[PDB]
Amino acid sequence: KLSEEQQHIIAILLDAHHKTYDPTYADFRDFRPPVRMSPLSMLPHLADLVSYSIQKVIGFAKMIPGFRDLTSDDQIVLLKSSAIEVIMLLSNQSFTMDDMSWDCGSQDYKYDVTDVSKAGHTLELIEPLIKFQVGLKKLNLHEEEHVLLMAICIVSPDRPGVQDAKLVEAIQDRLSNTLQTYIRCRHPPPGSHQLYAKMIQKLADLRSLNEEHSKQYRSLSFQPENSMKLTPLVLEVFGN
Amino acid sequence: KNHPMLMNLLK
């Protein structure tokens, strides 16, 4: 019941993922070094991590079937708004339920609540972010469902500033139907129970996290000396 | 709209 096109779409998204996500995290050594102590000591390191991840999110989006057909301005709008959400999704791969932290290959590059707090964020974001990572982890998505969820997150028509919303929605619909059919044919029970609905709920959760993140980003970036620690791409994307 | 680097990475 999974058509040839839908098996094609999945193969593409999986490939795009493999070419844009490095599970060895080798490049992290290029970042400004993580400093754990106290005042914003993790901002330069995590800011570089984010900036790096935006580049990977961009590379992924471009390989989403139909994404290229959008106008450059719609592409910009979709990436600007979803980037932090897709990074949070991407990060679930490094997130371990063992100690509720993001474990990226080593101890220096192991990130926990106190590391995120030392990036300038409060529990008002961090609590639901971990809550999100745990609940997403519990879903035990196939990698196919993971990459589909990320594509669907990027191509949302209700994003602020979207012009050709009809065209965006058509692209997303084709992806949603690909996901829904995949779960029915490829994801066995009980793991497939209400799985689509739960995955959609996660997209709602990400909107909320995106909103809280923006508020706290405006606070942090409001101060030039902290804004000074970010990267040009992070300012361009998370900025106005 | 005024996103040089984002648009450059998109092309």
Ligand SMILES: CCC(O)(CC)CS[C@@H](C)C1=CC[C@H]2/C(=C/C=C3C[C@@H](O)C(=CCO)[C@H](O)C3)CCC[C@]12C
């Ligand atoms: C520095 C402040 C800033 O708000 C950005 C302006 C981000 S802090 C907070 C909100 C946040 C979101 C993603 C989280 C994390 C992501 C982890 C990743 C590691 C790996 O899974 C990965 C690899 C890509 O190769 C992901 O893209 C990102 C864990 C730590 C905390 C991170 C950075």
